[PDB]
């Protein structure tokens, strides 16, 4: 599998039952979705420029 790395570029805001997840916009670094900008939820502290290994690039997290 090895997933697909993607770089975070902008942060929407906080989200969750206890507010411990963060929604961000990521750009797929490589794969079949090269250059596509999607939106995903993230658990844990995140900052601009971080890289997340998405196990898949299919379901985009909905609006806040």
């Amino acid at each position: 599998d090895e997933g697909y790395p993607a770089e975070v570029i902008e942060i929407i805001g906080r989200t969750g039952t206890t507010g411990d997840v963060t929604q961000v916009k990521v750009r797929i670094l490589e794969g079949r979705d090269k250059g596509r900008v999607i939106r995903r939820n993230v658990r844990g502290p995140v900052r601009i420029g971080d890289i997340l290994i998405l196990r898949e690039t299919e379901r985009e997290a909905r609006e806040i």
Partner: protein, 214 residues
């Protein structure tokens, strides 16, 4: 017991513990690469000074992070391997010298058993024990829903280190095996992807639960 030249070891170069260098250690995970500190450092002891700053742990050497994670009791409000490990007066809590000695002996054992750099083996174990996805509850409408979420590199590294420490504690708990031997065995198993490693087993379980939730 110990040789005098080892009891009075005198380093002369800036390297981890005065014995191992991180110049050849390679991290092939882009997510975890910026957060694993491998800068030239002799003594892995910063006396804290990083909890105040947000994202301050990114500038702390990985060996010191491992020492801090080892410096604990093992289990207070959760169960590891189906048991509590409440050691009150005989724990490593706030014993950095003891944690340092344990980590040094474990690194020596790892080096002797593998033939490679112990820091490289630790990096491999962290990479193979860091989960990539988790599950969490999100409240939309008037009720909650369990959905799968990604994990930040910071949390990935934290979970990997905590799982390695917990596995070492479980392996060393109430057995003839010592803490250093248990830590070395756990690190080697995690690096070799063997399912007996607690960290790798927990990573597989978490990823499977996340896949089921998504």
């Amino acid at each position: 017991a110990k040789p005098l030249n080892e009891r009075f070891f005198i380093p002369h170069e800036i390297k981890v513990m005065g014995r191992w260098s991180t110049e050849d250690v390679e991290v092939r995970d882009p997510s975890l690469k910026p957060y694993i500190n491998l800068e030239p450092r002799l003594l892995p002891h910063t006396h804290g000074r990083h909890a105040k700053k947000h994202f301050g742990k990114a500038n702390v050497h990985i060996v010191e992070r491992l020492i801090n994670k080892i410096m604990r009791s093992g289990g207070s409000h959760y169960k590891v391997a189906g048991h509590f490990m409440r050691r009150e007066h005989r724990s490593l809590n706030s014993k950095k010298v003891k944690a340092y000695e344990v980590v040094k002996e474990a690194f020596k054992i790892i080096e002797q058993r593998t033939g490679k750099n112990p820091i490289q083996v630790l990096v491999w174990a962290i990479e193979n024990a860091a989960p990539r996805e988790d599950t969490t509850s999100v409240m939309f409408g008037g009720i909650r829903y369990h959905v799968a979420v990604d994990i930040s590199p910071m949390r990935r590294l934290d979970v990997a280190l905590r799982n390695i420490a917990l596995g070492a504690s479980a392996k060393c708990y109430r057995n003839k095996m010592s803490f250093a031997e248990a830590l070395a065995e756990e690190i080697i198993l995690a690096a070799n992807k063997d399912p007996k490693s607690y960290a790798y087993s927990k990573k597989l379980e978490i990823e499977r639960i996340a896949e089921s939730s998504r």
